[PDB]
Structure 1
């Protein structure tokens, strides 16, 4: 075994014990490396830059989740400290080849991975980047040169900042006639495709920095989780817009046509694996103003009722069927984000930040790994896009929807509910009749494409 310096001259030389590092029973499934359960920051930074082997998964996890237990400025200090190794002949020649070069190389891998995949720490603190460039400048060596250059090229780059898709579908509204666009005038296939494209881009824009530390639930959520929130607000807007379309169609025949068309949009969302789209529709249908419209759902064809029940069933038993179905499909898809949010929050709130062993505090790294597993799953669905053509006018129409207008939430949701009670009064009030509002035909063009690909 190698003779390392004293802990008084080099902190990372201190040996492993029950007081500074602990492990899980299992090993990395594909790498055979032990799984760290907890440790001190010193021991975690030692194992992040371990001399015996490279640990890419641990680097991945650490760099995603360390901010809950160590500041960016403190991590940079601890990795520069790790690189500055003092000596404790044949013993020295082995030390320099089996301890110093591997460790120094692993520190540089951390630096590289940090500037590449978590550059926001540097964007948010210019002094952190000043120090990183300073450190990288002092690095000298033949083995180092190649990695020092790569890092410098990433920093400067970061500082600078398929086949034919299907034909676009049109129904009553024609290309460019943006003034006539509505739920029944636009083609139901194209509504679903264009909403799937918006919702996919909204999904792909959410980063782990908006999720780690449950920051979207905290007072600075608007600063720290802007892409997640835009995504949730689009979803909410579309649910509300669907409800608005329904209850503002006072004529029963026209309302049946409206509900039926939304169920067709749902069917296309199912085809495209847009589960966010699916649940937007299901949420609208199970809302207080829509759910009670028994005279409307009575006239809905059985095939559309069945489509709606299967979609509703995905959410039952704590998303049991949704969870199975998402696992069974391959990208492109648009997952429902809410489950991930709940799982990250509960993982973080339901587990301790620190574990105590022989009265010594150890950072609970396994809690952080569990969170990084959820962020990795989010990311696995963000890599693959859809092979659908954007229609810029239909896109702009859904981006600019604003069913609420200037009304507050309570005001608007009470207006929707009072509209529901007006169009279909509560028993034993008889059902009134209402005039038609649509001067165009109510018949759908269906969900099968009009022409061949």
Structure 2
């Protein structure tokens, strides 16, 4: 009781399964009871992407996220069009019956699965079409070719999405914005100590949340942020990282340029208070900006400064430092338990994608034949999926556009190159707290306003 397909000579996808063209993982798919594909030929991967027996949403999402390493977009389109155009089996010696069954159980389902691939492709990976206008031409003339009455509504929905893609408020009340010494409107006085530490953390969390949410799988798959075209292929990731680096460096700069010891203790305390509220907001990128500044070689050596830090804030810092220890053991656990909104640290995802792609082969070989290693791609797609799960939920916090501007336009390096600037910071560190046995000098005060923090607790109730 099997269908009887055409011969492989006329229709390539009728070639039966064997050890030479498709292999499976021993376990069955989550929620669905479908086989997990380990590896296959591109013909077999496309057969299963558009399989007649059942729909496979997981395989579709994973395939369309990761296919570009083993198959070109133009090739993929040609293959699904080839898949769509199914010839009927030749008559045996006479003549319906098995012919009408073939139309009902092979042709019609497969054609719908092909349309679903196009829908998903156009909806979630439209960048393929933006970068290759001819790909979009071929798609539209193909979609216009589809006649079936059952196909009509799926075709019309695909067209709707194409037209939409061709053209590029809070749930509950957010808390009141906090001000310390700098008044609203007076951007000229804005600094580390004059803005309210709560609001520094909130506005950096909004910036860093947006930066996190803009990064797409297309910037990550194929490890493209490490290759020569990284500025072309991964601009939003790089913008995100450059901000993180910017602020780490700004924290370091604030510390080492505050030459008076008492004032430097106030500066470090305030940065630890900002870390406290980063931690309250689950901005782990923010947490690690501070921890990286504190472990930088210019700041780490300032034993006279950290001596005068209140014990409570030492423990806040030490706790945050421990997240990174033992290959992010505590960070990993803490991220898995907390719920959105949050801003995770991207670096771990970067390393894991890179190592996954570097540490597994692109192809497996069986009986001399070459199979595409799909399980490798699934593992990359699982990581990009985890990245996406924290991009959906926004923060219930009001933007303050002047404070936003201040941190966006922050530029602690200036016109200096990296080596030049980090040498400057370290030489400053040696000036303000010389190496033993040299005596500790005194330095005059630079801040004419009060050093006392307003704390990390909201000033009014709501």
Q: Report the TM-score range of the alignment, normalised by the length of the smaller protein.
A: over 0.9
1:217-251 Cα shifts (integer Å, max 9, x gaps):
00000000000000000000000000000000000
Q: 2:144 is paired with a residue of what secondary structure?
A: helix
* Separation of aligned partners in 1, 2:357 and 2:242: 24
1:308-363 Cα shifts (integer Å, max 9, x gaps):
00000000000000000000100000000000000000000000000000000000
Q: 2:151 is paired with a residue of what secondary structure?
A: helix
Answer yes or no: is 1:270 the counterpart of 2:293. no
- CA-CA distance at 1:127 after TM superposition: 0.1
| Consecutive unaligned residues in structure 2, runs of 5 or more | none
Q: 1:362 is paired with a residue of what secondary structure?
A: strand
Partner of 1:367: 376
- CA-CA distance at 1:253 after TM superposition: 0.1
- CA-CA distance at 1:29 after TM superposition: 1.6
- CA-CA distance at 1:203 after TM superposition: 0.1
1:114-151 Cα shifts (integer Å, max 9, x gaps):
00000000000000000000100000011100000000
Q: Report the TM-score when normalising by structure 1.
A: 1.00
- CA-CA distance at 1:87 after TM superposition: 6.3
* Separation of aligned partners in 2, 1:29 and 1:203: 28
- CA-CA distance at 1:160 after TM superposition: 1.5
Q: Report the TM-score when normalising by structure 2.
A: 0.98
Partner of 1:131: 138
Answer yes or no: is 1:114 the counterpart of 2:114. no
Q: How many residues align?
A: 453
Runs ≥4 residues deviating over 2 A? none
* Separation of aligned partners in 2, 1:391 and 1:19: 61
Cα RMSD over matched residues?
0.6
Partner of 2:180: 171
- CA-CA distance at 1:189 after TM superposition: 0.1
- CA-CA distance at 1:163 after TM superposition: 1.3
* Separation of aligned partners in 1, 2:33 and 2:427: 62
- CA-CA distance at 1:5 after TM superposition: 0.2
* Separation of aligned partners in 1, 2:167 and 2:435: 62
Partner of 1:346: 355
- CA-CA distance at 1:434 after TM superposition: 0.2
* Separation of aligned partners in 2, 1:129 and 1:365: 26
Partner of 1:36: 37
- Go from structure 1 to structure 2 and tell me whether the alpha carbon gap of 1:291 and 1:87 turns closer, same or farther (over 3 Å shift): farther
1:246-287 Cα shifts (integer Å, max 9, x gaps):
000000000000000000000000000000000000000000
Q: 1:142 is paired with a residue of what secondary structure?
A: coil
Answer yes or no: is 1:450 the counterpart of 2:459. yes
* Separation of aligned partners in 2, 1:234 and 1:388: 20
Partner of 1:76: 77
Q: 1:38 is paired with a residue of what secondary structure?
A: strand
